[PDB]
């Protein structure tokens, strides 16, 4: 049973904050993908540079599974060519993305009555992230012309701000768990294959 651990990426109890998005490399296994078959349990399901109906007969050098939590109106940014706080400062997909984006409403897991504040995102950054870059630093962001000396205040901001996931928010402000599969093809033997060309 060298079966690729895709289901464990989807059914994990804990998901990372988007600024520190988790990456699991999937290698040296037979790809299941059966979790993708139930489109009804997802709020968005889209692949890019590949059709989902071809995954079972394809081979790849590596599969990366990226996962994190964002709010509802921000899921549209997990796509090639998008902009916004998530796509600029937290998680950027390349224009030539090859993979799938999966998300579902996780209000029943990640929202608490007093509000869940454990999920963070980056509000500010001197420049956009390059595709698949991760930024977990917490230097004070200088928003104005006057430099900060590591001290917060006006125009001197802590760069990570917290979501407020309350079960009674509107769906655009409810938490969404996102999984991003990227399929990597190098000039090297494939280690992850669909069950129809194992």
């Amino acid at each position, epitope marked *: 049973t060298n079966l690729c651990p895709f289901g464990e990426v989807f059914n994990a109890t804990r998901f990372a904050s988007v600024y520190a998005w988790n990456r699991k490399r999937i290698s040296n296994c037979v790809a299941d993908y059966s979790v993708l*078959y139930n*489109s*009804a*349990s997802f709020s*968005t399901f*889209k692949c890019y540079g590949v*059709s*989902p*109906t071809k995954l079972n007969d394809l081979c790849f050098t590596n599969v990366y599974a990226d996962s994190f939590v964002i709010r509802g109106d921000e899921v549209r940014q997990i796509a090639p060519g998008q902009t916004g706080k998530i796509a600029d400062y937290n998680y950027k997909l390349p224009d030539d993305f090859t993979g799938c984006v999966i998300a579902w409403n996780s209000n029943n897991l990640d929202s608490k009555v007093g509000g869940n504040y454990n999920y963070l995102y980056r509000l500010f950054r001197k420049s956009n992230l390059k595709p698949f870059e991760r930024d977990i630093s917490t230097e004070i962001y200088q928003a104005g012309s006057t430099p900060c000396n590591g001290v917060e205040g006006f125009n001197c901001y802590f760069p990570l701000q917290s979501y407020g996931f309350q079960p009674t928010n509107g769906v655009g402000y409810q938490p969404y768990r996102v999984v991003v599969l990227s399929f990597e093809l190098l000039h090297a033997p494939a280690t992850v294959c669909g069950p129809k060309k194992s």
Partner: antibody
Amino acid sequence: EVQLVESGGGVVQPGRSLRLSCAASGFTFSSYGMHWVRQAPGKGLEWVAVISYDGSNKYYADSVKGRFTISRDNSKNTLYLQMNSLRAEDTAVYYCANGFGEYYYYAMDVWGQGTTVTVS
Amino acid sequence: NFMLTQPHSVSESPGKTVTISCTGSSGSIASNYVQWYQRRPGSAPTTVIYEDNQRPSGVPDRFSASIDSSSNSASLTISGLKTEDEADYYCQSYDSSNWVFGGGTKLTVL
């Protein structure tokens, strides 16, 4: 040659029950999801239900939620739609369709030629 | 629930191009894959577009589709109109546990 031939009832009394059958040929039936879609005379297309290749996932349109019941038998290559408590607004040509690609069923691929169910 | 709304009718002259719109409501059209189905008078439906803008083998390149998240709409476009294109056109997708069809647009080739 992927073929879907629905067979089943025509004229039935309101409040009765009827069993639709869909015979699939020309593809590995067990590895595809299947949809039921109807088209009442004059009206447009309307989805009834869908069943996964396993039978483990079943979903229904709200307007048929309790009465209708989808099922399949992969040994007989047959899709079934059990509709009890038939009402008159369910009068339509009933199409049976397979999902695009194996397993996935977010889309329909080949459609059948339908059976016309008249409730009166 | 998530809804797909098409115009009731549309019509153009042979050789011209027409465009059928499919605008979602109570949900985003760009979230999930959008399909286009063609049902000729009396016939069974056939598939013409899948996964937003793909053509199955056999569908002429006169058929094209796209998404517009600004307007929350999908758009089928048929070029070089021919009388064989006269049909009802239904867009389709799904929101969670519900698969949705647009009301359907009858296309008349003048």
